Amino acid sequence: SVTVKRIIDNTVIVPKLPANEDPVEYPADYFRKSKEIPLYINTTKSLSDLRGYVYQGLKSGNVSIIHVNSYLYGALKDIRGKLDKDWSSFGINIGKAGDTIGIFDLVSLKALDGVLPDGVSDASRTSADDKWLPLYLLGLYRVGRTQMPEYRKKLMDGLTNQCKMINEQFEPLVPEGRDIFDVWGNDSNYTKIVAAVDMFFHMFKKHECASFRYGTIVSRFKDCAALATFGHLCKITGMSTEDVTTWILNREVADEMVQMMLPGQEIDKADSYMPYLIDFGLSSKSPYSSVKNPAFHFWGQLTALLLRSTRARNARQPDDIEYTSLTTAGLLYAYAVGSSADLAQQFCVGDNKYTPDDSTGGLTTNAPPQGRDVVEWLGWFEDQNRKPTPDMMQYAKRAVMSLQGLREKTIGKYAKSEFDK
Amino acid sequence: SVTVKRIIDNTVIVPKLPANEDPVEYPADYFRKSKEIPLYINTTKSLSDLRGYVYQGLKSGNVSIIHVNSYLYGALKDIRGKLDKDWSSFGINIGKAGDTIGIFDLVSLKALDGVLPDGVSDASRTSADDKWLPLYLLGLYRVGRTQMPEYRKKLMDGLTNQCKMINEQFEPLVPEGRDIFDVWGNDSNYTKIVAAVDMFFHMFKKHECASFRYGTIVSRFKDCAALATFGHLCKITGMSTEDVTTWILNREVADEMVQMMLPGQEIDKADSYMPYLIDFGLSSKSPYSSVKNPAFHFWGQLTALLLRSTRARNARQPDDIEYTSLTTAGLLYAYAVGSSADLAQQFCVGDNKYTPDTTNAPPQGRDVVEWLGWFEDQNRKPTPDMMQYAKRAVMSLQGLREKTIGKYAKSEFDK
RNA sequence: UUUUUUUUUUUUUUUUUUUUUUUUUUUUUUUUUUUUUUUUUUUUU
Q: What ranges does the record give for the region Interaction with the phosphoprotein, renumbered to this chain (chain A)?
């Protein structure tokens, strides 16, 4: 309808509305530009010194990020790990058959000049070093993310990990909520280390030091929720990835989907850079984020909730998506899966059940399709005047009533308002 | 009916009522007049000094706006940012062709003479300067707007931002509510800076200092709510902008609409001056305001509420609009969209579903004409199903502030 | 006794402001107050 007129007086009006941008950036379409990920670990002073500046700065309640980065690089240059097979991503050849490589085999540059305390702090601290101190430093990255009292839930475990080798304790005193170390995550160089470590131990899963993954793990797939919700959807319906896809039933979800499955981005790859696209700063607007995939995110989570997901009762309810239609589509999917059990004899002793029996005996009209086929159901749905039948509605009610403790703006609370009146 | 007579005695009466004015002012119809936006950053004394007068005045509990403006101009003349493509708005050619430009490439004049403390304050403060001090100053603009305890919600984040570089803390002590800095927003020169900064970093989205956008952002589209509600309406119904338009069903909403879509105002433009029409003082009565688009604003928000918007349960309920009719029209729109799911197979494996296969059964899709007609058939009075639809949309809403269209909606439909 | 709205008037008549506002919306990115890994009956000589 490129053209709209106003009837009263036959004048043209040209409906337009403010431009929005934030185009996503994929990982591949970046190793076009550079062919290395720069890690500006700056000053290169003694490790013995650095071990000091931190062990102090920590107990103190302030310590330069610049210092901790430098210390980490220091205690982590263990060139451990022997390449099982080969290894390469996005063209970059990280190593190969049994080469020996270490964490920072992901691209080190140095820089700047200014620091803090002079040359050499308090010698008091020894090689109660690598062992555990780095783990702490990395641990805090995880803790620095959660905005809620749950943080002290993690820190608890964050140290009841820790105790392993020396049995120390707390270091700061100040809660968090953003101010303390909670802002380390804002240091492009810090994150790059966290990512490099996680990506590294994800490969050498078995390694005395692979315990460092604690707290370094919440960097893997950071800002890739949509991919995850898609994964859960499959697991939770029993359907294949291609079958689940066909059940997508509104454009902007298909749009979203197409956007996520763009090829040659290595998402199905074992150990690639793609999962850390954010923390290595490969991309500044993830294509797989839940906020750039709102329609999908809603549909997928609402559906899983109707199918009894626990995860899904607390997902966030995006804004500016087409709710009513998104949820009608979810209901249907949920209803189809919900009433047609896979159900098929699996083992036997000489006597199977052949499902056959002259498969026609009950309702032939408004009895809904047998299996889980989009076409059968779409058609059945047409037959129903494209308006949810009372049973579906009943299905939804019995899935959302008896949910309790629902945070507002979650799709849990949305679902319960919509269906359990 | 230019003529009204009184039956009892055949005398003419001439109904008239008080004149109202506030005609709107568009942005374009202004770069007719001037061709520059004047920024009277006054005194031009040392930055080192200024850094002082504020760092003091702040911790104190009073500091001249005049000073802070000057300080800002001081720490912000970073001529950073290299023009990606070209850049021009309303005729004004801001930059070009790989040019390098900085924030204040939007028109500086100087003025007046009088100030406050003498020449040089407390040297105590250094270049813990640009880094973070300006951000604070700008941050306050945002905080200075909200009239509610939510302000300390923003200031919280307003500093837990802050904490990056230096880790400082509070500066005033006195809450807010209009008195402290909450009045900086009244300084035509202050705002002009806020706008210039926002408009600048909206262009150079990627820039070490682009973090300054915090708190400078609520100036973008300030007093342009109607435009926003129209955008949400589209997003929330799934309809195109031209299709949504056709669902407008009462004159004064069409009037309103026509007013908003006046051409050559650059509203669909990426980075124009239009969004900052108020803070650059391009216009003193926005055409896009919610108060100059009441009917639209009501209709648009009511409809979105029926369609499950969360945003919309708290919109304000304008006065002096035609409620009953405005809401009948909204209901219908909401009912149409609400019952006809887009619903269409999108991916396949060799076997698509071809959709191919009464009286008071309502139209199939979402077409105004089909529905208008169906509605005629219904004696232009909402059927029991619609009414039911409305109820199930508004009951189970809780926590409604009064004068919101949330509360209006719940009173009308969930008896 | 004579009185009688616990009425008053003087003007009034939104415990409305119009100057601009109107999601007690938002840096951005983002969103199970998920997860180290192993487990996961606050089962047991």
A: 349-389
Domain residue spans in chain A?
A: 36-218, 221-420
Binding region of B: 142, 151, 205, 213, 285, 316, 401
Q: How was this structure determined?
A: X-ray
Q: For residue A286, say whether its CB is under 7 Å from any atom of strand C.
A: yes
Topology of domain A36-218 in CATH is Rhabdovirus nucleoprotein-like fold (1.10.3570)
CATH superfamily to which B221-414 belongs? Nucleoprotein (1.10.3610.10)
β-partners of residue B6 are B11
* Fold that domain A221-420 belongs to in CATH: Rhabdovirus nucleoprotein-like (1.10.3610)
Which of chain A's residues have a Cβ under 8 Å away from the Cβ of B234? Answer: 17
Resolution (angstroms) stands at 3.0
User: Beta strand pairing status for B108-109 and B92-95?
Assistant: unpaired
- Same fold for the pair B36-218 and B221-414: no
Mark the nucleotides of strand C covered by protein, meaning any atom under 7 Å from a CB: 18-37
Taking a C-beta distance cutoff of 8 angstroms, is the pair A394, A339 a contact? no
